[PDB]
Amino acid sequence: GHQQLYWSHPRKFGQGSRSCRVCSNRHGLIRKYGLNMCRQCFRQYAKDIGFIKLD
Amino acid sequence: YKIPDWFLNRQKDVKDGKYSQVLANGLDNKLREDLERLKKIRAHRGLRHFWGLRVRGQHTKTTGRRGRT
């Protein structure tokens, strides 16, 4: 069955369980504190969330 | 004389399953029959010991320069 073979790889762990919430690319994720974002979109919305530059 | 079995260097031999602490001529004989066993069994490890390349899965492009001339 194609319906039962469509889910044959378990997506429990690895890189494919998580993805970017903006650009949907599984490269350079930030799993810190539940961003689940890539670095570039985090840069684009860093000050909108509230991350500023002081140090 | 009450030495623990796990301390011995060779455990669970393929010919008898008996734990035995082996010595110089014994290690040389066991190494050469193991090499001959891998050559006769024709495995990936046997081909690597025949070719002299890496066995434990490591790179050769950068390190291991002094393999041959």
């Binding site: 889910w7 997506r11 919430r21 903006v22 949907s24 | -």
Partner: protein, 96 residues
């Protein structure tokens, strides 16, 4: 795409009761979050709304991972003829 009758029409009164609905854009979604009483996936919902888009009844907007589908007045008329209702029932979008 061959849809069962019940799932498609259930999408139709969910669109008719409240004139706007959202859905996450992902192929591998075995169950819709809001409509979880019956086993309905999401890809049939996206394909049915894409068909409605191409025949010109709904609009599209996409921000991160969620599709936003916006009905029109002539879309409300199409829902009224497809659900076979008298022209007196108006959804809460036009109501105060």
């Amino acid at each position: 795409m061959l849809m069962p009758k019940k799932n498609r029409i259930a999408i139709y009164e969910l669109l008719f009761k409240e004139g706007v609905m959202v859905a996450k854009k992902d192929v591998h979604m075995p169950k819709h979050p809001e409509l979880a009483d019956k086993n309905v996936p999401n890809l049939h919902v996206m394909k049915a709304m894409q068909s409605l888009k191409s025949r010109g009844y709904v609009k599209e907007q996409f921000a991160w991972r969620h599709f936003y589908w916006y009905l029109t007045n002539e879309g409300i008329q199409y829902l009224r003829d497809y659900l076979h209702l008298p022209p007196e029932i108006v959804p809460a979008t036009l109501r105060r």
